């Protein structure tokens, strides 16, 4: 028994259509599953299909057990930023009396649609202090934050959701110990 699913990270924009391909090779008539792994958590059953032509659905996702093409492709009509996780296609013989065969897992990154992008670089002073940091914020999701030398540290982008205002933003942080360190050049 084997499970082969789509490799490499998948990046989609908010509300885009998602398709994660999964094909299997099985001895008889196995039970098929999708597991989801949210960042910093364990796996949890997303959905399943016990028999051919059965359709599992949960959290707006669906997968059809196609016996004709030995496949269990995952699909979602409108992805959300909260859908960012690792998805695992899996199979086990009927009854659950045997071990599960997992696919390698597909990392899904859902990037927000920034309505009014206004890239800005700000300097932040320490509350206790003479330490400072740079914040790159409010840029669109197609902006690639460039990596740093070992004296200047730059994080990757991260998505923040200010629900209180139905607002999402991207940000990255830069900091250094060098005396000649300006925010204007950091990013």
């Amino acid at each position: 028994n084997s499970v082969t699913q789509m490799e490499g990270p998948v990046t989609l924009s908010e509300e885009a259509f998602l398709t994660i391909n999964c094909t299997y090779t099985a001895t008889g008539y196995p039970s098929l599953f999708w597991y989801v792994q949210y960042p910093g958590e364990g796996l949890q059953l997303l959905l399943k299909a016990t028999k051919a032509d059965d359709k599992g659905s949960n959290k707006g996702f669906e997968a059809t057990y196609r016996k004709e093409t030995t496949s269990f492709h995952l699909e979602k009509g409108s992805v959300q930023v909260s859908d960012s996780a690792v998805y695992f296609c899996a199979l086990t013989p009927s009854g659950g009396y045997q071990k599960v065969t997992f696919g390698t897992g597909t990392k899904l990154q859902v990037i927000p649609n920034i309505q009014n992008p206004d890239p800005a670089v700000y300097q932040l002073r320490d509350s206790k202090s003479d330490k400072s940091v740079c914040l790159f914020t409010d840029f669109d999701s197609q902006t690639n934050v460039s990596q740093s030398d070992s004296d200047v540290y730059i994080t990757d982008k991260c998505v923040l959701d200010m629900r209180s205002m139905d607002f999402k933003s991207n940000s990255a942080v830069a900091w250094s110990n060098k005396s000649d360190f300006a925010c204007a050049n950091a990013f």
């Binding site: 800005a120 932040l124 990757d156 942080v173």
Partner: protein, 240 residues
Amino acid sequence: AGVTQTPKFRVLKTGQSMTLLCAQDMNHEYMYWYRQDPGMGLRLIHYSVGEGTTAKGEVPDGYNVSRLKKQNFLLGLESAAPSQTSVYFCASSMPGSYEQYFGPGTRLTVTEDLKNVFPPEVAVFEPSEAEISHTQKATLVCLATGFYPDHVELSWWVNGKEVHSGVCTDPQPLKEQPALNDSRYALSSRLRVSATFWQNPRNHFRCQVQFYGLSENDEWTQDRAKPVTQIVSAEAWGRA
């Protein structure tokens, strides 16, 4: 849920022994132990089909298991090696819904010397006046640095309550010395609130970094304090 793992984090010196415990009260006959590594997916170490029985998974070498009782499945490391640095997940299922239920994971780091273990330094950076005036929003930044191993949990606390909305933490800590072996780590987090909420001198903001370090039964023969499991915090009052 319902599957528990003990400990949740562990740092070990190379050649040292340890036992990972996994417990379950769902009267599930089957229990499993997996390890997760970048680009390697989820790989089965060992599994058990019942009390008393254990069988080999895909990567059983360097590990031993025991199923003394139906509720518990133990994973042993006789002589820890740096290749065993991983996230370990336990699972259980009941055949006869027979899907696997997973635990939260155990982060294990194998280091050459326990002298390398360091708690984080934590600082909070107040919002920019330029951001506030232009956007009517205020971003606070929390920076945790010089910690080893990368076994931290960063959280924001506003008026003594743990905040999740308007927060974002780096998915991975960065290496302070990319070239070096036992490099220490740095992690940042951001909290964004309205400018009026930040400008209230009655609003209290605190960044908390829960560090997982040495256990009480760990030998410590060093100049500084023992890097035990602790909470390192930095705070700021809202400024008008």
